[PDB]
Amino acid sequence: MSEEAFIYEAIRTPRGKQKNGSLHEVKPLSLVVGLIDELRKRHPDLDENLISDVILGCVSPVGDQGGDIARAAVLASGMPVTSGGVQLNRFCASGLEAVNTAAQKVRSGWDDLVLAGGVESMSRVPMGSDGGAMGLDPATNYDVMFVPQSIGADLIATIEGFSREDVDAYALRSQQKAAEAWSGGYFAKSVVPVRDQNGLLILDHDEHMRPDTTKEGLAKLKPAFEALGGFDDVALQKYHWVEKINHVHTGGNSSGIVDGAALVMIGSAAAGKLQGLTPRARIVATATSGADPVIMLTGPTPATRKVLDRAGLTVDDIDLFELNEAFASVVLKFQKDLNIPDEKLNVNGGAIAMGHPLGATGAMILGTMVDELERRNARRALITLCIGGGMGVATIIERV
Amino acid sequence: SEEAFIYEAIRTPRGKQKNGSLHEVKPLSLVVGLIDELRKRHPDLDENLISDVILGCVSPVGDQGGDIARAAVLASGMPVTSGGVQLNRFCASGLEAVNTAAQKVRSGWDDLVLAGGVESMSRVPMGSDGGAMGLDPATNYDVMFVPQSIGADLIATIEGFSREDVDAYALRSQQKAAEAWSGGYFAKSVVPVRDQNGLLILDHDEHMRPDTTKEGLAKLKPAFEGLAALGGFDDVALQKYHWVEKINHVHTGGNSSGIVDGAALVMIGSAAAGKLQGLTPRARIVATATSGADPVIMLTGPTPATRKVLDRAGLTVDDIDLFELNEAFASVVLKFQKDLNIPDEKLNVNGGAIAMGHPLGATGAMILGTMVDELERRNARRALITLCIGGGMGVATIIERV
Amino acid sequence: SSHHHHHHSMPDNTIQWDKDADGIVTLTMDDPSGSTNVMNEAYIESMGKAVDRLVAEKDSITGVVVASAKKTFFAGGDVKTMIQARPEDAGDVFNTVETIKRQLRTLETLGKPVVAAINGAALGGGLEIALACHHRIAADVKGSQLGLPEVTLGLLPGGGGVTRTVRMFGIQNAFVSVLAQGTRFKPAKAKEIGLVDELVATVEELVPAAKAWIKEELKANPDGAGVQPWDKKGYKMPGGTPSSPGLAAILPSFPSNLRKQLKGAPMPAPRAILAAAVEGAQVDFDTASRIESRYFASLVTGQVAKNMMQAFFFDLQAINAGGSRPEGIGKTPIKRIGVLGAGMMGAGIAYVSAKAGYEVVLKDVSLEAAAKGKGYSEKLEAKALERGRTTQERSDALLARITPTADAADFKGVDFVIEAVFENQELKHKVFGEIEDIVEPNAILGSNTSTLPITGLATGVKRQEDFIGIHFFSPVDKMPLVEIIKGEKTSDEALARVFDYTLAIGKTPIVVNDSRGFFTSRVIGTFVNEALAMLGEGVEPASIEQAGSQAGYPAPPLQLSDELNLELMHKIAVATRKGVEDAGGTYQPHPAEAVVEKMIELGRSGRLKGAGFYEYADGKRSGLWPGLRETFKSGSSQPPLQDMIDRMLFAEALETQKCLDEGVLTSTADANIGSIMGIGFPPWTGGSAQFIVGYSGPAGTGKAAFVARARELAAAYGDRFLPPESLLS
Ligand SMILES: CC(C)(COP(=O)(O)OP(=O)(O)OC[C@H]1O[C@@H](n2cnc3c(N)ncnc32)[C@H](O)[C@@H]1OP(=O)(O)O)[C@@H](O)C(=O)NCCC(=O)NCCS
Ligand SMILES: CC(C)(COP(=O)(O)OP(=O)(O)OC[C@H]1O[C@@H](n2cnc3c(N)ncnc32)[C@H](O)[C@@H]1OP(=O)(O)O)[C@@H](O)C(=O)NCCC(=O)NCCS
Ligand SMILES: CC(C)(COP(=O)(O)OP(=O)(O)OC[C@H]1O[C@@H](n2cnc3c(N)ncnc32)[C@H](O)[C@@H]1OP(=O)(O)O)[C@@H](O)C(=O)NCCC(=O)NCCS
Ligand SMILES: Nc1ncnc2c1ncn2[C@@H]1O[C@H](COP(=O)(O)OP(=O)(O)O)[C@@H](O)[C@H]1O
């Protein structure tokens, strides 16, 4: 709690789509190395020996993403051999958790300058690839009432009474704001186009975006679940008072499966000044909380409350709320629980529009908020994501 | 601002690789087992106050996939608010877990944290998870990939550690682990593994060979000539270490760390967090450091990390009562000892991984707990704990007895 | 490492050893202490000696045949021993089952072919001995069954059955086809699913066929002789191992699908089998085998296996051996059955009697009515032909056994009357009056009534000796219980005749003394009455239905309430009230009665009238009636789910004990099987009487724990939950 932690740079790749995506040919390691070389380009005289760690979120750390991808990045980019490299996994929140841990390392006083972020090539390393201590184990899968997150999202919609039209209205709005953000030039500085070994362009934009989405188009889509297991029945065994789960989530109002990476430079004031870096925002506070593991995407609500309480702030004090758009209903429920003003929420669009590359999303939506605070000349953003098993992570940042 | 304290440090016994007692046991159960032991020691602990569970795991795939830390929280019926993050910093994972927990506690934004690791190497072999440095040719060429075992032999060659020298270290590790066991040093901290019916599966470190002799160690065949000649890794190493004519292959199954199964847990918190739950602090985390050296030699990382952590704490080798460095290979320990001039009687005093085994993601937390106990037993003040890592990293931690 | 139960300083021998001139050893299992071979202490010591000897004489042995000298092959584990295992006996149970498997493992890795010669039933432990052989030949004889039914006793196949079938068929197939339900297969089916390799027509062919097979196998495949497929270098588990991508994709769904099937009921066995199956597939054979033992030991030393062994082994056995059948009485074969009434029940009763081979006259008030009653059997036969379970020739003969009529005179030659007309005494008098003089003088006069006392029905006939309650359950083609009710004047002979009829139709009998509501109706009454009370108290109907299903009932209580008519429930309550008010007493109505009356007043009295707790559209149950919530202020009472479960189970358990006290039931065996088969009391409890002695909850096990919990529920919900004196000190 000694040293203040500052954000000096926050960049990301564009997000490539799952089917015939432009990034499918690109190794997740290359995605990270590309971002390192952009930071190198932006600050050619930074003494890299002063970077003590590289912390990356990765949800499926296997195959192309195995063997501590953070250390692979350090070595592959030719960073000093003393710069560390650790892979971490806290599911959907991994990206922000890496930033949070980086900031906490700086606060402890034992690290000075850290690279944090995450990477997920979902088209090359599909969700679930890593197996899972739970699923590989019927004895504990049975005891712990595992249901996939989509089922929880549908259940949230059922309980809170969000209709199919309600969730699709949120989806349409996400697409609209992503489009507006892109045309507005809001992302020109932070989305770093991906190039090959020869300098040729592979991708410069979030290709999952469907900017011409309509109410009518969204209404035509089929529900995702009704997985073909028995998860509805399992869900209703815990939630015995609910008769029937209303399945409202589709490929149009759920986050996209995409390829992407993000990097955030975090350091103390001294670290940054010494290397001639300009701070863009300060990490005010972080929190980890959670809620029920069957309605698993309801953990952002107590996590936000905990980070607000900890920074001595109230909902009114926050200018921008950024909550990952894993599922429309999760967002709507969060907005309802906390009375979040519509115009303060996911103002530049979210993962329904641009995709949710698991381990990287936390860092992407953090950087998105750093840029937006700067652009609006506003003061405070709160960034939050739900997690599998019923966890939540949340961070407050203040523009400096 | 807040100091980080260790309140509990426990581990499983270590099951061996071939016909091992723990092979039948899921790594998840290893952790849940240790969580239940902590509950047994403090049944009135308010578990809602535990904000995170941080587990090191080097092969987080299959049984170890899917955030094993979160799985442990849920499987043990800990509060759903209690977190769960898996991390991987190779061999240092277990200690890295602890350090991160300490850093989180220091930052003020976490009160009480479970840290540790788990590696079931007999079920999830090392390398099961893939990775670019080994499996993608462009970057394998770029990082001059070489198995750590070859680095260990190269260290021996450059420093003039003979086969007899490395075997003599190996004998001492065996002797010291046997004395620690027979002495009851490990009675409180090693938690026997039991089945769903309460039947004993394992209550000791199976890999140990207390009847090791120097004669028997001399009979063993060098282990890493199968990777050296039939993989070309010797030639890769020597292209960088160009003044070295020939690598002397001195490491065997008897002077390298054992491949084993096991897990470790450590409870870390602030003074206030402990006071609230009636816990007695056992040690304070004084300082942490991560650092590194060349990735081809791979295992010289412990030295600059130890120097940095000593400097951060404003201490010298003389200020430290005990040194605990993971025994990945004998030469790495001998290199370390020579570099920093560590007195023999201060080094890995209770035996190490050559005798007891090196369950990757857990080892860092196991040898940490070992020092917490040994300080308390000897009534000594400070221990420094360190481990080498893959690709030339190092992590070090100084703890102080309370 | 030893093949024996002991290794320090006398049981009977059960294995006959014979070595051929060719070097073929025949092991003939023949326990001298019983009609069947069981996996008991004598078996274990016997096979240990034999297996030791196979090893010792290996230079002179070319092959092995495992055979039986009984009518059956081998009949499974020793239940008498297994039922007694306390938690502290886990170590011994684990050791026993590891020893059994060590012997079978040696048999299987001998380096020579072993063939099981399966003369008759090979069940559980029996089939496990066979699966340890390299080839299985089965005699295609009458009555012969093969399978692993230990899940039906709340156990698992702990002598290698899980490990081997998973090794043979993969996880999904072994679990779904063989293990999860423990179904018994005919030798022909056994061959089809791969449990058996070959069939011969007669028992005498087996041993020779086995020896011939060994001979050809040694000549044609010398390198792989006596090597199971999983013991070869290139082995590939069918469907993949858990780490294989195809299986990994569906695997997480397996426990959820199972929880769906079981509806959340606390039956540990299927879950343990699935964990054993999967965990075993992750590791080498021996490790897989040892995991299996741990899961086995876990079920055995638990309470549910105890409950289920008591009911589905001991209680069933006692019942099937004529425990409630009077002693002195001989047989009286049935020539012609007459059924009165062609509704669901009568049509159903006509079907099961016809399927059993009996001629049936099905009489209703019109030929049209009686015809549509026979149509019920035609429907069932149509399905049976489509599913391929019967031949056209066999079906046509079944249906031709049923003659529908409107004419009383057509009951000539009838020697067994089963009446199934409307629940009304004066009607039943009239209906029996129209028939008693037309039927044979010695005819049984049986009544399917759900409440009306038999003694009172009997007076409407001349020969009251032959008047009896023969109570079936809807749907008759599926429900396996017949509750036989002895009126005050019912003879012992009439009892036996109906007893024998029940067995003849493939059903299970209980004999009960005349009393209002008998056993089944009275007890099921308490169950649904608890549910309606919860609805009246303001509990979410959805929760009530969940509590019913998670308790283990085959149908949720409000749903069931619709099938039993609410007007029927009303006139039961009216009848009880009348008896008390006529005897100068004051009636204490059950809280449910007001809820029943409320629904009548609303014109929602059940499925038969198109509206109840559920909505019914075009012969289908749609969803719960959305108007229920406003009517009963649903949500205003939110008790723990376990309190709701317990209320239902406890109401029935308590009412069962009353029935036993009042002498309505005469054995706990009848109480248990009767509750399970008659009124769907959850199988995991072992029955409504076993539920008392075998209760397990947050605060203990046994009769004392049950009594404490019942007092707990009494304090919270009303005095009706206070235990009868018979349960207390
Ligand atoms: C994305 C997900 C819904 C899968 O959906 P999908 O069907 O593969 O995605 P698609 O884009 O193919 O959508 C399916 C259809 O909807 C259509 N669609 C999607 N968005 C649309 C829009 N805005 N307008 C019109 N059509 C649209 C697509 O064109 C496609 O049409 P097609 O079927 O004719 O090809 C699901 O896997 C998911 O998002 N899961 C969330 C991941 C997560 O949260 N992870 C947890 C981390 S631990
Ligand atoms: C340990 C390692 C050499 C594997 O060796 P191994 O041969 O599988 O293990 P063993 O103990 O069986 O090998 C030693 C042989 O000599 C015997 N032996 C081992 N230790 C002995 C001792 N102290 N005295 C006498 N004999 C011994 C063993 O029985 C074996 O002989 P056998 O072939 O007759 O059975 C190697 O895989 C290793 O050490 N890896 C460690 C991984 C690591 O360093 N960390 C990775 C972090 S990225
Ligand atoms: C094999 C079988 C179909 C043939 O039965 P039957 O010969 O017509 O008559 P029974 O079953 O009464 O057999 C006679 C004796 O064998 C005994 N017996 C049969 N199977 C047994 C078992 N698994 N354990 C202990 N005893 C058994 C009966 O208790 C009876 O004992 P008794 O003669 O001392 O009263 C029948 O015994 C049976 O179904 N066995 C049970 C198999 C089973 O359910 N498998 C799971 C158990 S692990
Ligand atoms: N056990 C229960 N039985 C019936 N309804 C419930 C139950 N639990 C929650 N609810 C419903 O949810 C609302 C309040 O509880 P809720 O806020 O959902 O609790 P949670 O913290 O578990 O989400 C009520 O309006 C009620 O309708």
What span, in angstroms and rounded, lies between the C-alpha atoms of A313 and A285? 10
Residue ranges in chain A assigned as alpha helix (H): 28-42, 69-76, 94-108, 138-143, 149-160, 164-183, 215-219, 231-238, 269-274, 300-310, 328-338, 351-354, 358-376
What span, in angstroms and rounded, lies between the C-alpha atoms of C206 and C203? 6
Q: Give the CATH number for residue C535.
A: 1.10.1040.50
| Number of compact structural domains in chain C | 3
Considering only CA atoms, which of A246, A201, A206, A233 is closest in space to residue A34?
A: A201
What span, in angstroms and rounded, lies between the C-alpha atoms of A394 and A93? 9
Residue A136: which of B1, B62, B102 has the nearest Cβ?
B62
CA distances from C687 to C308, C315, C684, C691 (A): 9, 10, 8, 6
Q: Where are the domains of chain A?
A: 1-125+186-283, 133-185+284-397
Task: Assess contact for B38 and B265: CB atoms under 8 A.
Answer: yes
For chain C, what is the radius of gyration of the CA atoms? 28
Task: Assess contact for A387 and A290: CB atoms under 8 A.
Answer: yes
Whether ligand 1 lies within 6 angstroms of the CB of A331 is answered as no
What span, in angstroms and rounded, lies between the C-alpha atoms of C466 and C416? 10
User: Distance from first CA to last CA of chain A, Å, rounded?
Assistant: 19
> To which residue do tokens 């429900």 refer?
C479
Reported resolution in A? 2.5
Beta bridge partners of A345: A321
- φ, ψ (nearest 5 deg) of residue C305: -55, -40
Beta strands in C270-375 (DSSP E): 336-340, 359-363
Please count the residues of chain B.
Answer: 402
Is C90 in Cβ contact with B199 (below 8 Å)?
yes
Cβ neighbours of B108 in A, within 8 Å: 1, 107
Q: Could you check whether the bond before residue C475 is cis, i.e. omega within 30 degrees of 0?
A: yes
HEC readout, C682-710? CHHHCCCCHHHHCCEECCEECHHHHHHHH
Are C306 and C365 contained in the same domain? no
What DSSP designation does A123 have?
T
User: Distance from first CA to last CA of chain B, Å, rounded?
Assistant: 18
- Identity at B203, one-letter amino acid code: D
Which residue is closest in CA terms to ligand 1's atom 7?
Answer: A251
- Identity at A269, one-letter amino acid code: A
Residue C290: which of B24, B197, B198 has the nearest Cβ?
B24
Is A76 in Cβ contact with B106 (below 8 Å)?
no
Task: Assess contact for C279 and C176: CB atoms under 8 A.
Answer: no
What span, in angstroms and rounded, lies between the C-alpha atoms of A261 and A124? 14
Check CB contact of A237 with chain C, cutoff 8 Å. Answer: yes
CA distances from A324 to A73, A88, A266, A354, C192 (A): 26, 19, 22, 11, 53
Please, which residues have CB within 8 angstroms of residue A343's CB and are 6 or more apart in sequence? none
Are C298 and C427 contained in the same domain? no
Q: What is the largest CA-CA distance in chain B?
A: 63
Please, which residues have CB within 8 angstroms of residue B284's CB and are 6 or more apart in sequence? B3, B4, B5, B6, B399, B400, B402
What span, in angstroms and rounded, lies between the C-alpha atoms of C50 and C47? 5
Cβ neighbours of B83 in A, within 8 Å: 90, 288, 290, 391
Cβ neighbours of B107 in A, within 8 Å: 1, 103-104, 107-108, 286
HEC readout, C561-616? HHHCCHHHHHHHHHHHHHHHHHCCCCCCCCCHHHHHHHHHHCCCCEHHHCECCEEE
Output the CA A249–ligand 1 centroid distance in Å.
Answer: 10
Check CB contact of B106 with chain A, cutoff 8 Å. Answer: yes
Whether ligand 1 lies within 6 angstroms of the CB of A362 is answered as no
CATH topology of domain B1-124+185-285: Peroxisomal Thiolase; Chain A, domain 1 (3.40.47)
**Which atom of ligand 4 is nearest the CA belonging to C540?**
4
Does an H or E element contain A328, and which? helix A328-338
Considering the four listed CATH numbers 3.90.480.20, 3.30.420.140, 3.40.50.300, 3.40.47.10, the one that applies to the domain covering A1-125+186-283 is 3.40.47.10
Cβ neighbours of A244 in C, within 8 Å: 623
Considering only CA atoms, which of B123, B159, B92, B128 is closest in space to residue B23?
A: B123
What DSSP designation does B199 have?
-
Cβ neighbours of B196 in C, within 8 Å: 294-295, 298
> To which residue do tokens 């429920």 refer?
A333
Output the CA B234–ligand 3 centroid distance in Å.
Answer: 69
Beta bridge partners of B117: B56, B264
Output the CA C29–ligand 3 centroid distance in Å.
Answer: 15
What span, in angstroms and rounded, lies between the C-alpha atoms of B55 and B72? 10
> To which residue do tokens 């349409």 refer?
A172
On the question of a common fold for A1-125+186-283 and A133-185+284-397, the answer reads yes
What span, in angstroms and rounded, lies between the C-alpha atoms of B116 and B97? 6
Task: Assess contact for A194 and A31: CB atoms under 8 A.
Answer: yes
Cβ neighbours of C550 in A, within 8 Å: 237, 240
Are C523 and C447 contained in the same domain? no
**Which atom of ligand 1 is nearest the CA belonging to A91?**
48
Considering only CA atoms, which of A154, A197, A163 is closest in space to residue A26?
A: A197
- φ, ψ (nearest 5 deg) of residue A262: -145, 150
- Method by which this entry was solved: X-ray
Q: Which chains touch C (3 or more CB pairs under 8 A)?
A: A, B
Work out the minimum CA distance from A2 to partner chain B, whole angstroms.
5
**B residues 133-192 lying closer than 8 A (beta carbon) to A:** 133-136, 139, 142-143
Is B63 in Cβ contact with A133 (below 8 Å)?
yes
* CB burial of residue C29 (10 Å; 0-12, 13-18, 19+): buried
Annotation-wise, does C219 bind a ligand?
Answer: no
Q: Which of A58, A208, A249, A386 is catalytic?
A: A386
CA distances from C193 to A14, B336, C151 (A): 53, 64, 19
Strands A16-17 and A258-267, bridge-based pairing: antiparallel
Does an H or E element contain C513, and which? strand C508-513
* CB burial of residue A199 (10 Å; 0-12, 13-18, 19+): exposed
Say what angle helices B93-107 and A94-108 make with each other, to 10 degrees: 70
CA distances from C86 to C82, C292, C308 (A): 9, 19, 15
- Annotated catalytic residue C4: no
Output the CA C36–ligand 3 centroid distance in Å.
Answer: 7
Whether ligand 2 lies within 6 angstroms of the CB of B380 is answered as no
Token pair of C360 as six digits = 């049936």
CA distances from C632 to B315, C622, C625 (A): 74, 20, 12
**Which atom of ligand 1 is nearest the CA belonging to A251?**
3
> To which residue do tokens 């601002």 refer?
B1
Q: Residue C361's domain spans which residues?
A: 334-517
Beta bridge partners of C280: none
* CB-defined contacts A:C, below 8 A: 92
- Annotated catalytic residue A58: no
Are C329 and C397 contained in the same domain? no
Q: What is the largest CA-CA distance in chain C?
A: 91
Smallest-distance ligand from the CA of B256: 2
Whether ligand 2 lies within 6 angstroms of the CB of B169 is answered as no
Q: Which chains touch B (3 or more CB pairs under 8 A)?
A: A, C
Task: Assess contact for A113 and A279: CB atoms under 8 A.
Answer: no
Please say which residue of C517, C547, C572 terminates a domain. Answer: C517
- φ, ψ (nearest 5 deg) of residue C581: -65, -30
Considering only CA atoms, which of C381, C345, C334 is closest in space to residue C482?
A: C345
Work out the minimum CA distance from B138 to partner chain A, whole angstroms.
9
Active site residues per annotation of B: 91, 358, 388
Which residues are near ligand 3 (CB < 6 Å)? C 34-36, 38, 72, 75-80, 121, 123-125, 149-150, 153
Please say which residue of C517, C532, C565 terminates a domain. Answer: C517
Is A130 in Cβ contact with B52 (below 8 Å)?
no
CATH 3.40.47.10 fits domain A133-185+284-397: yes
Considering only CA atoms, which of B212, B254, B257 is closest in space to residue B348?
A: B257
Helix (H, G, I), strand (E, B) or coil at C149: helix
CA C272 to chain centre: 20
Task: Assess contact for A116 and A35: CB atoms under 8 A.
Answer: no
- φ, ψ (nearest 5 deg) of residue C264: 85, 5
> To which residue do tokens 């040919």 refer?
A25
What span, in angstroms and rounded, lies between the C-alpha atoms of A191 and A251? 24
Q: What is the homologous superfamily of the domain B132-184+286-399 according to CATH? A: Thiolase/Chalcone synthase (3.40.47.10)
Beta bridge partners of B120: B261
Is C257 in Cβ contact with A230 (below 8 Å)?
yes
